[PDB]
Amino acid sequence: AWKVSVDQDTCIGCAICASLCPDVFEMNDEGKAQPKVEVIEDEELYNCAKEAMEACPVSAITIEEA
Template sequence: MKVTIDRDTCIGCGVCASICPDVFEIDDEGKAKALVAETDLECAKEAAESCPTGSITVE
């Protein structure tokens, strides 16, 4: 699955990093960052569904 983050809409709440820390982290700018471009971890989908701004896409 390909992981992308729209950094323009990300508010850096950290939900993604708390749900799936192997895929997401909050960077120095306070925005979510994908640690990997692709993953097979189901938690990436859960993080995308839990994102309050819909900034995460997992395809």
């Protein structure tokens, strides 16, 4: 279980995330990333989403674990 989130104020619509890792991060009505999933449990999906996080220029991707 890894829930993903994206601070809506930090984000600039740079869009490395939607590339890179597309099953996970999708560009909303106002050009700010959002996730397509409320939970990730596949690890290869996770990998791509952590990749995204390590990459986002303004770093507004936060992944989370329970």
